[PDB]
């Protein structure tokens, strides 16, 4: 419902309260462009907004227009536009816009250029006077001919991406209110488990869940989950993360630093405006590889109730090795649009490490330079090698602030044991501070592999004993397990290295 | 209004005073081509010039022409041209020219080549006798088929770029004269804050400012600023900068040098003509990275009331790594057109450093060679590494003059503290010369980070105390801050380096 | 040495941040040599014209060519090697 709100603020007031703007001496938007992956019911949404504004609705199924004989397409368009123009308040909704109006050298023929021209002239033709709004659909705005994202045409753009846990939950509830839902079924569980799913994938999931029951228990849902191949696995997930600061016990100095960098200018802007100094553009997290550099960045976004975007370095590598630096522009656009937000680069050193490369890192430069200061979008640069990052990135007005995100403290060790064991059976004779002390110099990773080794010893003992009980019938986790597990468990990062960050922390300063 | 003036000098006299030219034995321009980004109201401008000259006006909406069935396009064109020809004094204005007449191998079909041919023949067909002027629109002249920028056709070209503070202010006033403008609203503030905005973006800004009020205070404007995504962030901003020489206290020798290089030949040309010697083509700023090499270059432009253009080196890198050396030609064209001007290359060493590269630096060569001496466009080359610049650039008739832009003097330290603290609360027991003396060997950057650290200590103390006062209610900046801030603040550039510029200053000479 | 009280030594303390003893020393010595020079040059001038203490003039004269011995690099090197020696 959050989504509709925006589109109604953009539509309703200049569709059905138009005189105020045209008197106050401004313009309504005449081209609201919805985009985002398929499985999202943009059509549903458009008709929803048309019904709940009270406006004539005219669909333009792109395929349908493109399937006509050259001429009758333009005809159909003119027809549609006059039919709307006449019955207005009017929403003309263009489904699969990219079909009629693509990236326009991928157009081996002039008829399409005429068809697009037509749509441009029609788009130009409207008046705010005529009470007409044009909405349109596509996967990404990169798809559409840019001469549609002129001001005269599709000026306003809205992203309907992947839904998060809550959206997924809503959707599941909506598709499963009509269902033989068992008591052991957990919708929220599934909503949380359904990463990369969209409305469609969830619908399909509910559907297979039904069908395999009809061959509905939780088993069926989990099985259908086992089966489903979501569409938006590949799409860059933007959401506010739900890691609290107090989930990250200790690491305090960094908390307060990050707060002074990123929290104070969104939470007390009055002050920054008052003193006049303007905020850090962004940050750089360096230190040893066994830590939650990700999780801190999340935690500050969560703390500022701002969005979060992870660029895993394999995205970066994919760009360098392919020379698709273009897509940086698209990333920053995607952050910018989803303000306020932390754009988190993981392994910023990847491009530079792995040896248009300093260019991929450089596009990130040109984009940091060109991004408006005021837009509250922070930009955290992770590494373990301050030594390898193109130091231009560490020039003021870029990744100004360096932060040594060091090895976890005892409070934080505890925190991470807790995190790694959150959902698990853990008898109280696992004291975690016995584990805090023993694991001085340990990275998260080692605590983690301790916990995992323990858990695998537990599973092993469990099912080995169960099978032993099957064979003898056919005539929780405790510090036993753990000190067993630690009896082969590393200290990830050697003194050398930490001393190296120390040195390079001091002399970086 | 400044803009109109030119276009009226180019139009009015040969539209409505034509006999004088045709008698004096010359030709009027028959093709005035307006270009620049979208959001600029080139159409508005054309009709403005037509109304204020007193001439028939015929629009040719490119899309509209291209949307016709092959033939009826050419028909429409002929029709338009005869309709104008007949009612003349006549301005034929072509909106989105690039549509009908593109870069003409991006034309997978012969109909467009016919359509363009037609427009060429029509453009050829006119007489200054017939009292007809053709104006036309596009983003950049790179867009149009070059056989339109023949002499016979679109000979004269005018750039309507981004507007500067004043233009933005004018536009804001113009869109907001009809508005419930509060007393706390500051238009000039917003005009100054609206970098990369154009007429459209400003219109839209005013619009969201309205709409969010109607949910107008300064808050609404600043919020709408928080929201807006300007179009011309990416466009190379040309404007005369407003940094005085006396803003740059000290660094005197360089002032006078730069004056003798760049000021004397625009301000006393009589002399240069008289003695006969012809001016320096350009300059090279080298020295330590903590200084306002940019700001000096600005300051001399400001001093000569000439334009300014920064090529950040990431532009250069983007060109090298992409091998789009082409665009150098475009840059110099853009400077040349916006004469007089300083073309400021930042980090000229980037291409050469980062290792068609010496070629990107080399295109800059061919362009410096090919640029007309007389055109008053200076060309300042920044670095910190005279040692790495292709020394061909330092060959006479290129970057003849080298200038060591060294570390700031006490007057200049003061100047920079002042600049860094301009808008800030600063009690008079912050003496800045206590700060001058202590910061011998410091770069601007260090003064800056002193000031910023101070300011952050101030903000910290402030909001920490305010939150403490919230918790205790639920039962300016002073040299305390500063000597606090200096108690961890560097000296950026080490003796080694400065000695290295010394050496390389002497033996460069 | 003869040193009038308008040689404040803290004016000299502040200006000589990052200086080694050696530099303070060569400041003092340069001053003293400027003083001796001025002195006996003036005395010989007074011999020739008869046959018809040290003050911050001298010192800011002397500092107007006086080094900072040890560069940031080095001190940072002892810092580093002080930390990692420990
Ligand atoms: C599951 C997990 C693995 C892991 C690792 C790892 N290399 O396996 C490293 C650091 C934190 C880690 N966490 C982790 N995950 C979480 C939390 C938490 N504790 C606080 C913390 C975070 C980052 C930093 C310090 C301490 N730790 C907090 O609860 C939510 C998730
Ligand atoms: C705010 C600021 C930061 C900064 C830096 C820096 N390393 O961050 C370097 C150089 C100038 C800088 N400025 C600066 N900014 C300005 C001015 C000015 N001082 C005059 C001057 C410039 C260069 C040289 C001498 C003296 N300095 C002049 O007023 C307008 C802006």
Curated annotation (Swiss-Prot), chains A, B:
In-chain residues carrying the UniProt-annotated modification N6-acetyllysine: 271, 274, 428, 500
Outcome following mutation: residue 104 to A: Does not affect methylation by VCPKMT
GO molecular function: ADP binding; ATP binding; ATP hydrolysis activity; BAT3 complex binding; deubiquitinase activator activity; identical protein binding; K48-linked polyubiquitin modification-dependent protein binding; lipid binding
Localization in the cell: Cytoplasm, Cytosol; Endoplasmic reticulum; Nucleus; Cytoplasm, Stress granule
UniProt keyword Magnesium present: no
UniProtKB keywords: Acetylation, Amyotrophic lateral sclerosis, ATP-binding, Autophagy, Charcot-Marie-Tooth disease, Cytoplasm, Disease variant, DNA damage, DNA repair, Endoplasmic reticulum, Hydrolase, Isopeptide bond, Lipid-binding, Methylation, Neurodegeneration, Neuropathy, Nucleotide-binding, Nucleus, Phosphoprotein, Transport, Ubl conjugation, Ubl conjugation pathway
Effect upon mutating residue 108 to A: Does not affect methylation by VCPKMT
Positions bearing N6,N6,N6-trimethyllysine: 106
PTM annotation (N6-succinyllysine): residues: 428
Broad enzyme group: hydrolase
Phosphoserine modifications at: 231, 462
UniProt-reported outcome of changing residue 178 to H: In IBMPFD1; uncertain significance
Family: Belongs to the AAA ATPase family.
Domain comment quoted from the record: The PIM (PUB-interaction motif) motif mediates interaction with the PUB domain of RNF31.
Disease (UniProt): Inclusion body myopathy with early-onset Paget disease with or without frontotemporal dementia 1: An autosomal dominant disease characterized by disabling muscle weakness clinically resembling to limb girdle muscular dystrophy, osteolytic bone lesions consistent with Paget disease, and premature frontotemporal dementia. Clinical features show incomplete penetrance.
Oligomeric and partner information: Homohexamer. Forms a ring-shaped particle of 12.5 nm diameter, that displays 6-fold radial symmetry. Part of a ternary complex containing STX5A, NSFL1C and VCP. NSFL1C forms a homotrimer that binds to one end of a VCP homohexamer. The complex binds to membranes enriched in phosphatidylethanolamine-containing lipids and promotes Golgi membrane fusion. Binds to a heterodimer of NPLOC4 and UFD1, binding to this heterodimer inhibits Golgi-membrane fusion. Interaction with VCIP135 leads to dissociation of the complex via ATP hydrolysis by VCP.
Physiological role: Necessary for the fragmentation of Golgi stacks during mitosis and for their reassembly after mitosis. Involved in the formation of the transitional endoplasmic reticulum (tER). The transfer of membranes from the endoplasmic reticulum to the Golgi apparatus occurs via 50-70 nm transition vesicles which derive from part-rough, part-smooth transitional elements of the endoplasmic reticulum (tER). Vesicle budding from the tER is an ATP-dependent process.
Record protein name field: Transitional endoplasmic reticulum ATPase
Organism expressing this protein natively: Homo sapiens (Human)
Species classification: Eukaryota, Metazoa, Chordata, Craniata, Vertebrata
Gene: VCP
Residues included from the entire protein: 210 to 763 of 806
